[PDB]
Ligand binder design. Structure first.
Ligand SMILES: [Cl-]
Ligand SMILES: [Cl-]
Length: 108
């Protein structure tokens, strides 16, 4: 019940670097696999419309928190990003240069 998602460093609630609250801390999501299915789940869960793009490679900067998720492979209609298939939690397989991001339609 404590899980939560936000976008940061994008200048709007509805675009930016994806962060998930896990074990007390906001962590980032590695783009080792990242796509618009994943972005659409994020955009929907936040009430931000639909994804227009899903930029990886720390486009919205590198987080400082733990990298909590990687290999996230949503189908696209999941209600929460954590409900999508993913490679457990806290894999330590990535660096922050791979932090994933989203741009949603509701961004202004
Ligand atoms: Cl929000
Ligand atoms: Cl947790």
């Amino acid at each position: 019940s404590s899980l939560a998602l936000r976008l940061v460093n994008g200048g709007d609630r509805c675009q930016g670097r994806v962060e998930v609250l896990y074990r007390g801390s906001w962590g980032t999501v590695c783009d080792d696999y990242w796509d618009t299915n994943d972005a659409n789940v994020v955009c929907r869960q936040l009430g931000c419309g639909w994804a227009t793009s899903a930029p990886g490679n720390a486009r919205f900067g590198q987080g400082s928190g733990p990298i909590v998720l990687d290999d996230v492979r949503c189908s696209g209609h999941e209600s929460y990003l954590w409900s999508c298939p993913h490679n457990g939690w806290l894999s330590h397989n990535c660096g922050h240069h791979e932090d994933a991001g989203v741009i949603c339609s509701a961004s202004q």
